[PDB]
Structure formats: C-alpha cells, structure tokens
Design a protein around this ligand. Structure first.
Ligand code: K
Length: 86
C-alpha cells in the first residue's frame, strides 16, 4: 500500500514533527517506517530517494550523519502542499 504522498511531503512531515525542525537522515527513515508501514517492506531505493529529495528540494537545508533542517522561508509553501494531499 504505497502512500498517497510525495517524498518531499513525507520528509516535510518528519522534520516538522521534530522539536527543532531538524533531524538526521536516520530519523527520517524511522519516521517514515513508523507512520507509513509501506516502507518497512518497500523495495530498496526509497532511502536513496529520500537523500535525493533532501538535496534537490530547497525546503530542506543542510546544517553545518548530519542534520537536515526546514527552511523557514519555504514552510508556508510546503504546508499548503501538505494540506492539498491530506
Ligand atoms: K537542498
């Protein structure tokens, strides 16, 4: 049962559910496997898809196993994208 969601939306859920708005890459996996059981048995490559969407989407920024944080300037746009698909 694939989630009716994009990878950027799923990453946005994991990061906005963080108290600091930032998580390491391993925590994003744990969030997706916990809240969406499809990824527990999904074929390999979705973990690589998460790292691609982190680098490609401007909403996620690398802080300087690192951490990925939400860009406050892109939260309103990603939120509106979240609501459309809820
Ligand atoms: K990025």
């Amino acid at each position: 049962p694939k989630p009716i969601y994009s990878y950027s939306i799923l990453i946005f859920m994991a990061l906005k559910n963080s108290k600091t708005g930032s998580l390491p890459v391993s925590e994003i996996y744990n969030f997706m496997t916990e809240h969406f059981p499809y990824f527990k048995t999904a074929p390999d490559g979705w973990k690589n898809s998460v790292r691609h969407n982190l680098s490609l989407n401007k909403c996620f920024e690398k802080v300087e196993g690192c951490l990925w944080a939400l860009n406050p300037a892109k939260i309103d746009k990603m939120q509106e994208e979240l609501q459309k698909w809820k």
